[PDB]
A and B are shown apart, each in its own frame.
Chain A
């Protein structure tokens, strides 16, 4: 309810994205999180956490 579902898009040029939920009311700052990306076969940063 209060939580807003968000999508994390790889900072690289690929369109592969991950799905997760963050409470925007308490944490409006964009996330700085890196997670494995299979298309580039490495670890890439994820941003734009709504």
Chain B
């Protein structure tokens, strides 16, 4: 509706692209980014400062022509700034004590709602979780419980 209205909208997308290049390689693969865009990211930091502007012009160019919300939404989870991400972790730890203290009454909800949960391994993990807590041993396996639930949270496959 206004040429300058598009301008600030496009410029806002430009600084978003400048945030992707300023993000580490290990966390770069987390976002569902296409290979064509991904390949342009690695060349962006290794190019000289003036070429970064051209690369920033590149990154903005084919990022506007496609959908942006899933990329922005996925980036928000990694930054842990989207509201649904932090509450998801709240319920993820809310089912820990619901499961680590009983071990039988909490598995029903997980299997009924999530069909990719390996109940063969989950029961054994709770067996170790009960053993370490009862024997007042350091929680060397409690961390792995959260990783498995977190991994299955976003379709581990």
Contacts and interface: CB of A to CB of B under 8 A. Distances in A.
Nearest to B64: A1
Contacts of B64: 1
Contacts of B65: 1-2
Interface in A1-48: 1-2
A29 to B, nearest CB: 19
Interface residues of A, number: 2
A2 B64 CA distance: 10
A2 B62 CA distance: 8
A10 B15 CA distance: 40
Nearest to B65: A1
Contacts of A1: 62, 64-65
Contacts of A2: 65
Interface in B26-68: 62, 64-65
Nearest to B36: A4
A1 B64 CA distance: 8
Nearest to A50: B36
A2 B61 CA distance: 11
Nearest to A1: B65
B133 to A, nearest CB: 55
Interface of B: 62, 64-65
Closest 4 CB pairs of A and B: A1-B65, A2-B65, A1-B64, A1-B62
